[PDB]
Amino acid sequence: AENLWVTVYYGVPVWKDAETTLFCASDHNVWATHACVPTDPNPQEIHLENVTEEFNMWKNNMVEQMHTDIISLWDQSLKPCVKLTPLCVTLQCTNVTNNITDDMRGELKNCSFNMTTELRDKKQKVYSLFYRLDVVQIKEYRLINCNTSACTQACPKVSFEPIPIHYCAPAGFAILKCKDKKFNGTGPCPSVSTVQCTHGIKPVVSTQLLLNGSLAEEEVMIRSENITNNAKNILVQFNTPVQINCTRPNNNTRKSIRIGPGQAFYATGDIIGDIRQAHCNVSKATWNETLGKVVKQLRKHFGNNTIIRFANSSGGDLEVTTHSFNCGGEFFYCNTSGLFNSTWISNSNDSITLPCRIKQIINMWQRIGQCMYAPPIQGVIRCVSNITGLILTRDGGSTNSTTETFRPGGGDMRDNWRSELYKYKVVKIEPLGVAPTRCKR
């Protein structure tokens, strides 16, 4: 009676969730663009009407792929140049006290040691300036890493500056982007587009502060996998940036020592002029306004008549306890204590200065047994950056008290990538379909 018959169609627009491997698209650097394809001058986007998709930032497979690719590129970049095997010798060290302030006392050590030469039957006597965090007493000191493993030197010619990278999908797969504002990273998105691939993402490595990121188009956004649980970090995205100016003012000097055939070690000769502490500056009124916006948004989730406290970091390693970043090739670790120190109750030109330290022996990723020795940078260094987000954690959270305390956090670098790839997902097409029609073979 129906007289309707099955009919097969190939190439229908139907897709499903899937996982695959995206490839490069990017316009001497650590993040090698040589093995990455050039990007198209005019990217294309197709807005899908009447299509509402499901999104979840906390179960995105692209973050893991990005992390693995970044680590792999990092590993490849450090291969073809010197390994600092002979650096582990007994060092005779003294204090540096030539034109220093009251806060830099004991932070620098003038050390002398013996070293090999190009000929294996000759030795030389050399000296260099080391940081207090790099040497451990055995008047005799040794490098911190020799009792764990020998490890390489940073390679002078490659630069650490991040560059954008785009991830484009293979054939048979599509990338869907959610353009709905106020999207908190999980749930249904009604506005959807198909993009060949994403906007340029800078792999910025930092802790406790997201630098050179993206800004929300509507207002401050707060995201968390389970806001009720205190064990999950909270990601805060600003709508406007906060300028921060960091500097190392010491006039450093660099010298080269030939430690073998075609092998040179770069040491710090001496500092010309006064010695002062590297430090950063951030505006006070702008920070206060940003914190006001943040607490206003937090009151939406944590009650309207609750006291919100910003306090100091709990503790642990220097990297997790301090905002760690790279400026001008030098690794800064800084004590963001003057920022997250206040309490908020429901109801000109000075700037906050953070004095802070530099390091040379680096364990970038959370791994044990591989360092990275950064050669010194000659001369004064200054660098300006934008702060566009925060990674907070709720302390305690019991029902005994009516006050919520938030502290800075970090450590894991997957959260840094999660803040950029939150609005993208990958799907695979299902060309085959069956429908009713009135033929008969």
Partner: protein, 130 residues
Amino acid sequence: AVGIGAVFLGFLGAAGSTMGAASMTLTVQARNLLSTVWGIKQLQARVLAVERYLRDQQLLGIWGCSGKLICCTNVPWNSSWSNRNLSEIWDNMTWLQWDKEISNYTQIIYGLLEESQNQQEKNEQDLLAL
């Protein structure tokens, strides 16, 4: 004829369109399907895509619809699978919604198609025997 622009449809430009309108853009989707360790991964992805395309082509050939994008068959449509009439399907619904609705009636349809094709082949072979 002077002042009107022209453009081409995208890979998934007809996703939001109705089934009747979306069925006229099968070639745009069909064409896209074909086209140290990182090289291994790319080669594996390409080989997997080729294998999937070959499997789909073989499945189409098993039903007797080889070398066609649209091939309407002899299997009648059961009312249990869907009760909506044609007017409410090809003019008021999209392919995604249709796939969602009948997602739990596909394997039986495939089996019926295979059995019908086998019966047709046997009948044709018997007819040619005379």
